[PDB]
Amino acid sequence: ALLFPLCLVLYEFSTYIGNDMIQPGMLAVVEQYQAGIDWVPTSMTAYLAGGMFLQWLLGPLSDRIGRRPVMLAGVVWFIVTCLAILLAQNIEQFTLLRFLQGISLCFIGAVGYAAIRESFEEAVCIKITALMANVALIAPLLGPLVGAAWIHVLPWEGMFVLFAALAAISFFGLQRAMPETATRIGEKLSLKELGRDYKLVLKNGRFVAGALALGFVSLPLLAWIAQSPIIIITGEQLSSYEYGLLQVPIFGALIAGNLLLARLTSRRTVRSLIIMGGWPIMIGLLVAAAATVISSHAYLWMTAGLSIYAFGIGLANAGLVRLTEFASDMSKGTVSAAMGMLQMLIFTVGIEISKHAWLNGGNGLFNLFNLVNGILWLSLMVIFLK
């Protein structure tokens, strides 16, 4: 019974470290290919861009042909594309395979989590949702620490063998444990019908504002994940110790913000938690921007600002995700996929803008772009909350 949700969580973990272990490893990757450091954050951009490729299709598709075969195909695709990147002959082919690997991210929410809601009761589903949320918080903390430790002893190729191996364990467990729970098995799938749905959700102004706001507000965190290898190691000329150590207060604060959210949710509305989290979000981004404009190498102030920011994200984002879902009356699969794709668009484009910001203006410009993104979230929250 519970072997199904556990293997889905193991698969979730494997795809999350698929990003988070690789980013510190990208310094070794670009050294092996003799590619520029500008390809380091583009690894994450490709991986994210893959995750918005089939996200629209898979929910409606798996409802018609079965949750089992579609989920198993996504796990097998992840394994094959993880092993396939070892044969990449240049950084362009490497980046292409990061994109193909990224398609595997679509299957977690659209196919896997849909089957969890259909299978289990409301009480058990909430416990599984919380476990998946905890794995999402642990991955970006341990990922860079483990990735940095991995690369000093073992080659980058081994990391993809690890992700494939962890995904292969979840495949066999999902093969045995996952029940078929698709409701519309046998019915026809119309692409024009899907077109009509996704055009209709985008007409909702509050839904779009909330989804866009989630993308803008989390972009500084994702930009840090993408670039912190090249910012700290290449830019500031520091070791993996400093790199790994500076992840702790940032992602520890993100966890702390979520722990505070858990203790406050019974006596706070989602509106108040957005306003309460908004103070650390804006103050954190201001401190990081102002310090690095005053002095480009003020990386401890940057880390302090990002940690205060991350605390507010942990407090505010889950509530905004809920309000954005309530803003649209259309089906949960369409609503989840649409707001997921809107965030991914902002993350992919944002990380590339962030890359060019840092390459042209150093830490100051990196943090100033992140501040603008915080202001765009804040602007949207003024409209979104009347």
Ligand X SMILES: C[C@H](CCC(=O)O)[C@H]1CC[C@H]2[C@@H]3CC[C@@H]4C[C@H](O)CC[C@]4(C)[C@H]3C[C@H](O)[C@]12C
Which parts of this chain interact with ligand CCCCCCCC (CB under 6 A)? Answer: 54, 65, 69-70, 73, 287, 290-291, 294-295, 298, 300-301, 304
Q: Which is nearer to ligand CCCCCCCC, 24 or 364 (CB)?
A: 364
Task: Fill in the DSSP letter of residue 296.
Answer: T
Instruction: Note whether 69 binds ligand CCCCCC by CB under 6 A.
Output: no
Q: How far is the CB of 203 from ligand CCCCCC (least distance, A)?
A: 14
Distances from the Cα of 141 to the Cα of 169, 245, 249, 254, angstroms: 23, 10, 9, 10
Q: Rounded to the nearest 10 degrees, how much is the dihedral formed by the CA atoms of 84, 88, 92, 94?
A: 50
Beta strands in 84-147, from DSSP E residues, in sequence order: none
Dist CA 181 CA 300 (whole Å): 50
Q: Judge contact between 219 and 355, C-beta under 8 A.
A: no
146 binds, among ligand BNG, Pr ion, ligand CCCCCC, none (CB under 5 to 8 A by kind): ligand BNG
Q: How far is the CB of 36 from ligand X (least distance, A)?
A: 22
Q: Which is nearer to ligand CCCCCCCC, 4 or 56 (CB)?
A: 56
Residues 6 or more apart from 256 whose CB is under 8 A from it? 311, 314
3-state SS class at 186: coil
Instruction: Note whether 195 binds ligand CCCCCC by CB under 6 A.
Output: yes
The piece of 146-154, 188-196, 223-231, 377-385 that touches ligand CCCCCC (CB under 6 A) is 188-196
149 binds, among ligand X, ligand BNG, Pr ion, none (CB under 5 to 8 A by kind): ligand BNG
Return the residue of 7, 8, 13, 19 that touches ligand X, per CB under 6 A: 19
The piece of 65-73, 146-154, 186-194, 369-377 that touches ligand BNG (CB under 6 A) is 146-154
Dist CA 142 CA 133 (whole Å): 15
Dist CA 14 CA 111 (whole Å): 17
Q: Judge contact between 234 and 244, C-beta under 8 A.
A: no
Give the interface with ligand BNG as residue ranges (CB under 6 A). Answer: 146, 149-150, 152-153
Give the interface with Pr ion as residue ranges (CB under 5 A). Answer: 197
